[PDB]
Amino acid sequence: PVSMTKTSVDCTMYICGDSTECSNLLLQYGSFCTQLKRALTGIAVEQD
Amino acid sequence: KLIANQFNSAIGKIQDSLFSTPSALGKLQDVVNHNAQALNTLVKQLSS
Amino acid sequence: EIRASANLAATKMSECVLGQSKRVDFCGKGYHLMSFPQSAPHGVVFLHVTYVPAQEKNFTTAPAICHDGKAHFPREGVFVSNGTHWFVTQRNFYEPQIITTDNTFVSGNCDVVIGIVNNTVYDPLQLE
Amino acid sequence: QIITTDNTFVSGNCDVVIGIVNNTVYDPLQLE
Amino acid sequence: SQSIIAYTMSLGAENSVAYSNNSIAIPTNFTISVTTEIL
Amino acid sequence: QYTSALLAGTITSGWTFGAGPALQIPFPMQMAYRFNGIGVTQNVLYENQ
């Protein structure tokens, strides 16, 4: 193998389908999903 | 004599290339930035 | 990840620095000559001094030379000719030499190799 | 080993190399 | 007189050696270069 | 296309295209070279081509 498919999960849409209340609850949980987006970007660049 | 001059010129040029390049050592800086960012997020999360 | 890179750096040091590495495109691009390590904060930096060829001329080639019913093959290098005279030369540098019995080893019957080109080879022992 | 024509290959003009040292090399074919 | 353009990649400068049954090219000069590897 | 170029380099130029400018090589001679690279002389290939 040389690489895998590049996935670009976004926290807001995955964990809160178009719900502002859920979005606020996620936001109050702090920046737990910025790290997730950054890690996925890192692995994508790594496959490239 | 010729190869000695070539080697001296190349040794002179690598220094100027490292001086003038924006960041050719992006890997050490990359790991340093990664660790600093990870620690910074560890601290920042506590303010949630 | 850092330990994988550290193992790679240790192997690179032990091969390129403490000896010459025949592995192509391991210690710098091209044929490798030395490598001078340098220290860096939380890392290491090498100076892969590599040897790369230059201006090239294409002449002619023949896999073997048939002097007297027997094919001659070069002990090392190519059978090259600038158009009139056939020369044996080294691998990555043009050093033509007069074809003698020392530069070639004889084996065959001048009937099976494809691309054989007629010529004369010389000896030093008949003259003396 | 004694320096003979078998142990060495000759190439140059004795004017370009640095560190050249004079000596005598030997051959087996002149004797015979 | 300046703008951002988009184009398909170029994988490199197009080149082609000429394989001939009796063609050999041998370099007559040589160069020394010093690269850099950072780990 | 990358792999096609990589393959064209390794059949018309031997291995030199991995080091410097690519130099054309007759393929029987390249095979004789590789044979020379494992301890068998060129005559083996030029006789059993």
Ligand SMILES: *[C@@H]1O[C@H](CO)[C@@H](O)[C@H](O)[C@H]1NC(C)=O
């Ligand atoms: C050498 O190769 C070049 C390729 O551009 C060709 O034009 C030339 O005729 C060749 N010379 C000989 C002597 O084969």
Ligand SMILES: *[C@@H]1O[C@H](CO)[C@@H](O)[C@H](O)[C@H]1NC(C)=O
């Ligand atoms: C080929 O090389 C020989 C040896 O130096 C020289 O005498 C001759 O003139 C050369 N001829 C051509 C066509 O290059």
Ligand SMILES: *[C@@H]1O[C@H](CO)[C@@H](O)[C@H](O)[C@H]1NC(C)=O
């Ligand atoms: C080479 O020389 C031999 C003997 O003189 C002759 O039989 C043969 O036809 C020649 N071949 C070529 C290609 O000149």
Ligand SMILES: *[C@@H]1O[C@H](CO)[C@@H](O)[C@H](O)[C@H]1NC(C)=O
């Ligand atoms: C070596 O011998 C040659 C010829 O006899 C002479 O010209 C030269 O000066 C000598 N050099 C040394 C260092 O003895």
Ligand SMILES: *[C@@H]1O[C@H](CO)[C@@H](O)[C@H](O)[C@H]1NC(C)=O
């Ligand atoms: C190489 O040999 C083949 C088969 O004999 C022939 O068809 C082709 O024209 C030859 N090419 C050259 C450049 O001699």
Ligand SMILES: *[C@@H]1O[C@H](CO)[C@@H](O)[C@H](O)[C@H]1NC(C)=O
């Ligand atoms: C080889 O290249 C060097 C560097 O450009 C140059 O100084 C030298 O004259 C060249 N040698 C020949 C024989 O052209």
